[PDB]
Amino acid sequence: MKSVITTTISAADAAGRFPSSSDLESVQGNIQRAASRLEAAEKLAGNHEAVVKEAGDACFAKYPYLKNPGEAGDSQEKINKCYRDIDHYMRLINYSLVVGGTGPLDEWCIAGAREVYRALNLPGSSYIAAFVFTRDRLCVPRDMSAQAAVEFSGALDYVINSLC
């Protein structure tokens, strides 16, 4: 679980050092930035039902062939799994904002997505279409503050970069 605090602590532990002046300056960075970062976590938590439905709808419209037989999504049971997976991703992006780093994303989303999506054979380009639309629909400042939006675009751009 990479974070500002744990990276600093693990660095000092490996060298066998007490938390020094440089170690406590890093934690001050979280204190200053926690204001905007915890504002974006609230909005996503308060509107995850509407955001997921909008993103998932655009994913299938961009690649309608996924509805065809033999592909990922040829039945109702398979489609409602696609929306569930997007809800998983939007949930762990919400965790990344609270925690303050790519910790939750790297361990529960990106750790083995390369092997799993190949074996079950669901294309990864369709996931990017879901998050690209969410990133482009983000509007400032009707949705969140100017600094909060930058943090939210920071988390989305990491998820997209994983599949690219």
Partner 1 sequence: MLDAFSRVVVNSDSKAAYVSGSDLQALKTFIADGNKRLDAVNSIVSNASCIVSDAVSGMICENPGLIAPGGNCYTNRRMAACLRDGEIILRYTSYALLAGDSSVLEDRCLNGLKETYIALGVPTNSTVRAVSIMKSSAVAFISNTASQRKMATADGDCSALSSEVASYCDKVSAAI
Ligand X SMILES: C=CC1=C(C)[C@@H](Cc2[nH]c(/C=C3N=C(/C=C4\NC(=O)[C@H](C)[C@H]4CC)C(C)=C\3CCC(=O)O)c(CCC(=O)O)c2C)NC1=O
Annotated binding site: 28, 43, 47, 72, 78, 81-82, 84-85, 127, 137, 139, 142-143, 147
Q: Does 119 bind a copy of itself (CB under 8 A)?
A: yes
Pick out residues in 12-71 that bind partner 1 (CB under 8 A).
12-13, 16, 18-20, 23-24, 27-28, 30-31, 34-35, 38, 41-42, 44-46, 48
User: Under a CB-based contact definition with an 8 Å cutoff, are residues 126 and 154 in contact?
Assistant: no
Q: Is the bond preceding residue 64 a cis peptide, omega within 30 degrees?
A: no
Structure tokens at 159: 């998820």
Phi then psi dihedrals of residue 114, to 5 deg = -65, -40
Q: Does 85 bind ligand X (CB under 6 A)?
A: yes
Q: Report CA-CA distances (Å) from 28 to 21, 31, 98, 121, 148.
A: 11, 5, 16, 44, 18
Q: Does 145 bind partner 1 (CB under 8 A)?
A: no
Q: Does 101 bind a copy of itself (CB under 8 A)?
A: yes
d(CA 24, CA 27): 5
d(CA 139, CA 155): 16
d(CA 32, CA 28): 6
* CA 127, 128, 131, 133 torsion-angle sign: negative
Under the rule (CB under 8 A), what is the footprint of a copy of itself? 2-4, 7-8, 10-11, 20-23, 25-30, 32-33, 63-65, 96, 100-103, 114, 118-119, 121, 123-125, 151, 154-155, 158, 163-164
Residues in touch with partner 1 (CB under 8 A): 1, 3, 5-6, 9-10, 12-13, 16, 18-20, 23-24, 27-28, 30-31, 34-35, 38, 41-42, 44-46, 48, 91, 94-95, 98-100, 103-104, 107-116, 119-121, 140, 146, 149-150, 153-154, 157, 161, 164
